A paper describes a structure:
We next carried out a local refinement focusing on the upper one-third region of the complex containing a [name] dimer and the best [name] density, which obtained an EM map at an average resolution of 3.55 Å. The structure comprises two [name] monomers, a substrate peptide, and the N-terminal region of [name]. In the atomic model [name] approaches the [name] dimer from the front and is ordered in the N-terminal adaptor domain. The space between the two [name] H1 is widened by 8 Å to accommodate the [name] H1. However, in the front [name], all distances between Ala-302, Lys-327, and Gln-331 are shortened to below 3.3 Å, except for the distance between Ala-302 and Lys-327 that is shortened to only 5.2 Å. We tentatively assigned this density as a substrate peptide that co-purified with the protease and have built a seven-alanine atomic model in the linear density.
The [name] carboxyl-terminal processing protease (CTP) [name] regulates some of these hydrolases by degrading them. [name] has an N-terminal adaptor domain that binds to [name], and a C-terminal superhelical tetratricopeptide repeat domain.
Author numbering:
A (entry chain C): 44 to 183
B (entry chain A): 38 to 374, 416 to 436
C (entry chain B): 38 to 373, 412 to 436
D (entry chain E): 193 to 268, 277 to 326, 347 to 436
E (entry chain F): 418 to 436
The structure:
């Protein structure tokens, strides 16, 4: 029931953990991002994204969050974290798509903060997002 | 600025890959990682080890007297079950089963075919779980005995009076409350003589050890000042020293301490504290001679790892590790033409009392 | 598909760092990881070991022929260094060492946790060197045995004639070239009894095993059809199947193989092949049950690890390592020619005579 | 008469077992030889005055004075105490078993009365001569304050040896850097007087206990 | 002894042959 590490994945994750414990956190984040890319497994992406968010970087956080959300579609928290991170970069249609995907499974949802993040973009994007939100309301 | 062991981790990854891809039985990663942890803990020094769930649980039952049982300790004699000892003042042992009882069947299976340890484990179980056993005595008809499993406190110190005015305290093992027990015993001990003890023969022969705090507590119970033992280790918290409260129930009575070849660290602590301080006469064989105070660090899981955090030093500053205590009298087990060594200790105590006069 | 066990890897890394931080001696990460490798290999399978660069070089070429050794072949299946077999014609056999007894300490050093390879290496020494072994006999009181190690040179085969028409072939150890000696002994015996025999009590007891090729040769000598042993293991090259040549110097003599608790892998191979192919009658006690085959796997750079790469199988589905060889007739060795000495041999010879008589002419 | 020994690094054993004109000086001779064999005042001297028929009274007085420097040895003519004590101050444990008769016990007598020594062993044999106190040697004999009947002690050899941590592979080095003693074969090169004779072993053990607890 | 030893050969022989 448990997957098996490849040689390279095992070695990279071991050295990443050692670097993270020795305070060389950048090495850990880079190795974890690469392993999330390759393995595509949920847990590796989970650890990578938590590390990235702790550090506070944006690009690695976004990539890892997308990989995590795609690797664990069941995990609603993954979906909302990916939507939030994407919204940090100025993209919101995918954010609302992910919010709708979460809406299938009951749980905590993030709408007000994402609306605030999307109200500052170009007028066309905000108008389209508001139309989509109204249509979803008609759908609920 | 210390670089990570990149090449060494490369070799480790290659070794694990080959071991998983060559070993005949399909072995999953978790097993090999656990084995590696056990290995890098055990291969440093003999005493350091990795304690799993069951090992950690049984060690916790060891270092704390209370454990789940029937209040009875038993054993096997030439393949026959016999009752050894019912622990006094324990609800599970209140049944007062007859000594030497031979339990034919336990938990629906005869005692035959399973080792004494397996039978004890069958008797052992979660507290509050009733059990039924089948016993036959003197060839009579078998009968069913109902017992109630419960948490029983196990005494670690046994007290006796050998000669009027002289006592005897044997410390089977050091447990969390052992120190306290010793103190209590001392009080009642003097009560047995109406408040006057001419001597005492502490028996630490074959005492595998135990918690350091209990050893310090017993030493202080027999001491009235000075440092008892101080530990040294690389980390900051390990560096530690202990003291002795002025109060002493012993009443400065003459003390003879017995040390055998099986007197391990914890008993060696008391022996060295009472020897390096001119407070008692050691007599016997060289102790096992290990000093390394270990710590049971709890992991994120229930299992924990035991590691040699520090060594300990006697008040004189000499470390007893790897060399052991050398008893002053140096008596060896022999026969006189039952316990020859204890008889020699009592004779020495009586002679010292006489030559001390009043 | 499945999730990686990243939790266990994280736990291992944190354990390593905590061990480094909270230890007495200043221990670097390299030593910790090397110990991790050694201990994972040890815990996985006792016979397996991690032969490093110097050990690999030592294994590549034999150091010297002067070194002797006690001779006993041991196994760590019981948690201690258990004596699987005291080889015949060796000081260890002449002493009180009996197969199945443990070895707690050697020359005063306990062997509760040390690897089998380390204990064996410490066992070997210069010729005539004294040594003291603490042996726990069937869980009894430990006792000290003093022995003088010396060079070991055991004659492979020994052919006697217990009675006109009945032979007896003792195989001390399956050294190299054992096949040639066994065949020559069979030929000379056949000459001794005018080119005909009524029985041959092949005595493969207290045999610490040896070269698998020689064992296959011996099993071939008595067989003309079927396979002797076939291996199984996960790697692609693990499987190795052996065959029996039609030629046989046995001459269809009825056979009785004696199995004692000291039997080893090669002796187990011969016994199991002969028993399963219905060509023999096992007569001694139960075997030991060692069949694993260890192959040194080269590592990345001048290192290797000896790991149990496959295990043997008798021609049937029975695996010798799992259950050993179970003889058809169990006769417990005891005191009442070689027949008059031991009970097993006398029982076997009497059975052979009775079978010959009752088969008709 | 005298015969010295060294049973331990600081526990001499000055057998006498006979009194004569010579022993008066030979006692001091062997005492000096013991002092040189072990530098400084010994930890305790075992004066095995056992099975001693006796001898010249004045030699007994000389030995007594060589052990103590004050008091009257015996009164009946009394013998005083000189200021010179070649014995310095060693805790003296004289032995009396039943052969201690007349002159021999005199040497014991004064000692037992001056507290300078402890009379270990079985009761002694016991004009007229009196010990320093009113008690005599013929009225009731010498009664040792510690009675240790003679016996034989035979140590039992253990087939299995309990390994020490020096044997365990890769044990941590000693804390102070001192050498680690391995657990090799242990045996007595010569049968010591202690294990052969029970009374002497008891005396030596009592001396060791007295020294460890009480100063000297 | 004699009878008992033959008893082992009485059936021990047959089982070796089988049927």
């Amino acid at each position: 029931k448990y997957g098996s590490f490849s040689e390279d994945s095992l070695y990279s994750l071991l050295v990443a953990e050692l670097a993270g414990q020795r305070n060389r956190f950048d090495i850990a984040l880079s190795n974890y991002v690469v392993q999330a890319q390759k393995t595509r497994d949920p847990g590796v992406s989970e650890r990578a994204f938590r590390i990235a968010e702790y550090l506070g970087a944006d690009q690695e956080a976004l990539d890892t969050s997308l990989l995590w959300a795609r690797s664990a579609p069941d995990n609603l928290d993954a979906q909302r974290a990916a939507a939030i991170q994407l919204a940090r970069a100025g993209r919101y249609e995918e954010s609302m798509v992910y919010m709708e995907k979460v809406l299938n499974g009951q749980g905590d949802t993030h709408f007000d903060f994402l609306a605030l993040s999307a109200a500052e973009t170009d007028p066309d994007t905000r108008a389209g997002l508001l139309q989509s939100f109204d249509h979803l309301l008609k759908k609920y | 600025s210390a670089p990570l062991p990149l090449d060494e981790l490369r070799t480790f990854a290659e070794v694990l890959d080959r071991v998983k891809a060559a070993y005949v039985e399909p072995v999953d990663d978790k097993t090999l990682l656990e084995n590696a942890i056990k290995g890098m803990l055990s291969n440093l020094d003999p005493h350091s080890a990795y304690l799993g769930p069951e090992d950690f649980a049984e060690l916790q039952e060891s270092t704390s007297g209370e454990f789940g049982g029937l209040g009875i300790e038993v054993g096997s004699e030439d393949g026959f079950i016999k009752v050894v000892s019912p622990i006094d003042d324990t609800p599970a042992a209140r049944a007062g089963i007859q000594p030497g009882d031979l339990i034919v069947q336990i938990d629906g299976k005869p005692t035959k075919g399973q080792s004494m340890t397996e039978a004890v484990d069958s008797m052992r179980g979660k507290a509050g779980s009733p059990i039924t056993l089948t016993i036959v005595r003197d060839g009579g008809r078998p009968f069913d005995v109902e017992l109630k499993r419960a948490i029983i406190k196990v005494k670690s110190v046994k007290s006796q009076v050998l000669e009027p005015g002289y006592a005897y305290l044997r410390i089977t093992q050091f447990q969390v409350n052992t120190g306290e027990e010793v103190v209590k015993a001392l009080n009642q001990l003097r009560k047995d003589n109406k408040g006057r003890l001419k001597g005492l023969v502490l028996d630490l022969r074959n005492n595998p050890g135990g918690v350091l705090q209990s050893a310090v507590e017993v030493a202080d119970a027999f001491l009235t000042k000075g440092l008892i033992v101080y530990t040294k280790g690389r980390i900051a918290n390990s560096e530690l020293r202990f003291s002795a409260d002025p109060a002493d129930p012993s009443d400065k009575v003459p003390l003879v301490v017995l040390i055998n070849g099986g007197s391990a660290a914890a008993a060696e602590i008391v022996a060295g504290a009472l020897q390096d301080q001119k407070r008692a006469i050691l007599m016997g064989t060289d102790s096992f001679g290990k000093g390394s105070v270990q710590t049971v660090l709890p992991l994120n899981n229930d299992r924990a790892l035991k590691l040699t955090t520090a060594l300990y030093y006697t008040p004189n500053g000499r470390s007893i590790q790897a060399q052991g205590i050398v008893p002053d009298i140096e008596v060896g087990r022999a026969k006189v033409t039952s316990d020859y060594q204890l008889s020699q200790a009592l004779s020495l105590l009586k002679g010292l009392s006489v030559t001390r006069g009043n």
